[model samples]
Target: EFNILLATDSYKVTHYKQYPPNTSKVYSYFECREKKYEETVFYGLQYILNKYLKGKVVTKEKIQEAKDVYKEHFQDDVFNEKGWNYILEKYDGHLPIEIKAVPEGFVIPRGNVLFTVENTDPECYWLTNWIETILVQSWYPITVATNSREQKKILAKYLLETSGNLDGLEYKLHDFGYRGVSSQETAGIGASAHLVNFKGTDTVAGLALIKKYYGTKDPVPGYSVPAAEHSTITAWGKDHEKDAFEHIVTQFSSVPVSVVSDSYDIYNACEKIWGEDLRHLIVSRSTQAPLIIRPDSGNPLDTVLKVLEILGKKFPVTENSKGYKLLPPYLRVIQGDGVDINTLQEIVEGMKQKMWSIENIAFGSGGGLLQKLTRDLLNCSFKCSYVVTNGLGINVFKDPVADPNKRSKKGRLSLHRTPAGNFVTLEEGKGDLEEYGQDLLHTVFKNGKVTKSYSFDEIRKNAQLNIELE
Candidate 1:
């Protein structure tokens, strides 16, 4: 039911006529031009390619539909009927384009080329930038992955500092961003990107997306445990709050479960109900299955500390190798209120100040993890750098003096790693052949087919954080 012909900006339809006469091929590249973060995790391109751009994308009926829409929308016959017909007849409705990109989940610094696009057939020269609108959407997944990895660095730093190990780091941050995002598709894409850095998610769409597109035999790309919500707890009535909490503990006692503790008074719930009334039930469960206490409202740092203090007095407490206090293995806390990069740091630092081990706490983020970001977050841009016309290759670029930041790279580009292990972008294909023997950019798609694919496990390994976290 999707029309690839209409999947681009309206202005892009007019570009086929505006390119210099006799244009044969157009080459462009995508990159993050900002220094917001030193590095970015490249991901989700494969999903986009397979879903939107692959195999027999154009049909006569779809082309005619776009023609009728554009003719009335623009009040003119600006539609490229000839170009559409040519692709339908010559290529059997498959787009004639080639895309080369750095492997999905590869981490690289900003200011480097992430991918390149060009028309494979001279007749379809305008198709490259015509589809730029969709390709540029790669920014969404890349940005989400980059942000998730950045948070991982913070978690890793505090985990090693307080707990003396990186164990259980995969479940440190959970994805609660599904309902907060704009669409189911956005939730799936953004959550799967987050999964590249961590293994926990509440967005079932993320696991569906991975199973469908990521070429994985693994059934669960991301995981979540049974957890409570305001409705489930509140429906039980205020007087039955303890009964609701006890119900969940008895129901899901054999595995880790989270219960929203702040439905009424979080302090009262923790001190009297959980730490007092239900403490015996919780402590008697196998220590391997933790009953996670989730405080949904209040100042996250202050509330977490108070909950820890109350739970510490009721449960047997031990210290890690770093001398930071740890709740018994069967008890933990998850702060799901107002969590972002900054607030997470504040909470972690607050715990460290009180000498509490990082293992005693986890986090759940909603809007801050998925919806609270924009394309400008990474200053991502897609620009043409090289074109071939009239049997000649010409370098093309924009250099606006008014805004030097918008100045773009010129000519053919190649991404490479220097002998010293720094990534660099070289113009005019200068880095095509390097001491490392080849460019980092691989031909991932050609002539409407995916040439190379990465499995979910491979992506996880590639995106693993290996930096020294301070």
Candidate 2:
């Protein structure tokens, strides 16, 4: 209909496969064979013999011989017609079909349900009841992955700073979400999500999947990145505080060091040994990376502010063109006590207002991201109702009892989100085409498989990504 560079005539699209008179063939065979015919020679011959009839080994005459026996000896149009109609009536005239859901990579929160399916015909209600689980299984992993991925993107923003607080360390973020998750699949996909965001992950299997799916490089594998140190192994407060701190600085010295100050006196240790210990390592060795220290508990925003105050006062920034990446020498402080997106957002917003290195903060989110954010992972509330049931018992059409929790809103219903910014469910004697819209579903599945494709890196990049409430 548009002004076009080229023109072509429209034509009907149709399947090219050979068609068989399936109902007819089955009926005559079933009549000859009776109820006992189910496992006997006749049904097997019908299934196997007719299918292979066109092959060179099974001549056309042999197929006709079996066809003749069934037609002459066992044909019954009345019985066959009843059986065919029974099947058509039972299925409501359609094959058991699969409906497609929305493509993944959308970060949906727990308590927010996405798409759903129920049999279009009432006869199919049982066909629809167990469906939400399958769609979730197909759709959920990557949505969770994308959430993890987005957070790492923000983490990368902080880690990229070239001066003060966290210097000399490669930016590493791993899907540290698994421990807080319930299962291994969550860990694998969750880690994969961060990898998509260009963040590293702590789990090895997740790394393997990343390599296989997205063709990305694997981050060094292990539990070393951060938990935000739920269980950092130290001297258990028995070792000389100086000695323990020194051990962390030198031993796992090449990479970032993870130390938990809450083991002993938390703030005093931060004041006394954390900075000094980090400096001692820098002065003692020719090393050129940052140390990341974790404070296990207490008020995160307040504690992080205090830690950064001490850090800025102690190790101020100065630029050097020749220095590698020019990051600061002091270890960065990460708040993992009970980190969540809201608190992380607050921490990031707070850091923006000060010269305190924003690079100094990394978020450790468990339970919340992996569990609480998912509907199933977090638990959700949704159900479906049978809106129509009509017909009689020798031949009946019936709607199930109305359930409000699972109620079908009456009439030809449509839903629209209003300009007033609240949702409204609308009813129509005849459906509205202009003001009405339905959530789009069924566009992505292909070949009995999910047609959606995503890179692991992309999923990770989407996790920490957010929009302004304003």
Candidate 3:
């Protein structure tokens, strides 16, 4: 899961020691564009440190493995064995980079330093160059988390307007994107990101992350219920659809379970099968137990409304303080198709227009929750700001001739926060630490060693605090 892309060095970078001439040291930073995200959910740094860089150095065995692969893949001129061996011997297998970053889970405005890095020994600046590919991959989870928090804000607003409270918001948006992602790591990271904003998920890899990294012993951060799929219902035969629905209830009696109702006829299943056929079993089975009806196809918004309409007529409706109609406690609906942030907002808006309560439904987002976004969604980029050569330091940056906003930062940098909580960027040179606002960045990693470790609970707390600040 922690595998770095082997092709990162195949382009843009050459030999392991390759960089511009006389480049002894380089300072680099990471941040998102201000226009895309309100606040960045800083995460995945600990994984890079503790898991990826754990050994603190490249062992002779590692060098041999890479040489075996690269020598065959690269023509003799491109492989640069001399340069790779130079780095291996000088750094003694351990990376010489120092990573200073905000604690995992804190939220900060865009265009500020999420983290910064420089080689401990100025001569090993190229060591950090190959790391961008690994580090930049962090953007996926961070973006997923930030976008998920936005989804929560939307749900909370409707929940407040329709129900006059935020109860059950944790289970409002469940992660259903495990199979939609590119790899297991994306599922783990993106699902965990969603968990930062909600407590329901079907992504099993996320729970693994919580236990392995976050120290969760008893209560896990996210949960799921016994839910039925098309195969489960169809396997019972179309004639036995009713039996299939009844099996789920009896199998998980007195517990919450979801049954996908749109096997052959969604409307008939909802009206006759669930509403009329099994109405008594659902209504009289248990007062607190829930039976969530899922519609997996067609227009999500219209399908959800149609399901609600069908159930509303069959079940008794109760009015909240806001006077919106809500389904009874025993029944609910979940829409798991074509659910992205915009579609969700549109669905909620349509619900409000129909004067339906938000508590009547929940959402299950697959690709949108975990796979739809890219690094460009946040305009995430890394650039060299300052580099030391010989004895003089140079402030370097690229200013696009056409786009002024694409300009980069310059000089040795540090991040600080004012008493009022605004972040500040300091340009003090290396070996200089002038008195300024509190330094927010700390040495999370140095010379292949993890200087600090953060628990997932701590990260969640920091994320919650940032959410409140927004």
Best by TM-score: 1
Report the error of model 2 at residue 462, Å: 7.2
**How does residue 341 of candidate 3 score in lDDT?**
96
State the lDDT at 241 in candidate 3.
Answer: 96
Please report the TM-score between candidate 1 and the true structure: 0.97
Clashing pairs in 3: 56-94, 57-93, 57-94, 58-93
**Tens digits of lDDT, candidate 2, 1-470:** 11100111111001001112221110000011011001100001111111221123222343344344435544521112232233245543332323333223444332222333333333333333322333334223444444444454454455443232233122333344667777886566555444444344455566665555544333432234422242334533455766666666677666655667667667766666765655666434333445666776777777777677766555544434323222255456656666665566566656655545454556556665555554333223223321333321011112457633322233332334456744344433223565645643332322123344444433333333342111
Error of 2 at 7 (Å): 52
Ranking by TM-score: 1, 3, 2
Local accuracy of candidate 3 as per-residue lDDT tens digits, 1-470: 32232435465346344566777787888877555466788887786566676553465565566567666776444544554466578866677788888888888888877888888775666766678777877887789988998888889888888988887888999999989999997788888888877889999999888777765446788889899989999999879999999888889879888999999999999899888988888887565678989999999889888888888888898887899998888888899999999999999989988989999889999999899998888877777788787767889888999987788877777777666868767664532565664567888888868888778778877777323344
Q: What is the overall TM-score of model 3 with all chains considered together?
A: 0.93
Q: Which ranges in model 2 have alpha carbons more than 4 Å from their true place?
A: 1-95, 107-125, 134-175, 189-198, 203-205, 208-233, 283-288, 318-330, 352-354, 373-448, 457-470
Model 2 TM-score, all chains together: 0.54
Question: CA shift at 249, candidate 2, in angstroms?
Answer: 2.1
In order, the Cα lDDT scores of the candidates are 0.91, 0.41, 0.80
Q: Is candidate 1 or candidate 3 better by lDDT?
A: 1
**Higher-TM-score candidate among 1 and 2?**
1
- TM-scores for every predicted model: 0.97, 0.54, 0.93
Give the local distance difference test score of model 1.
0.91
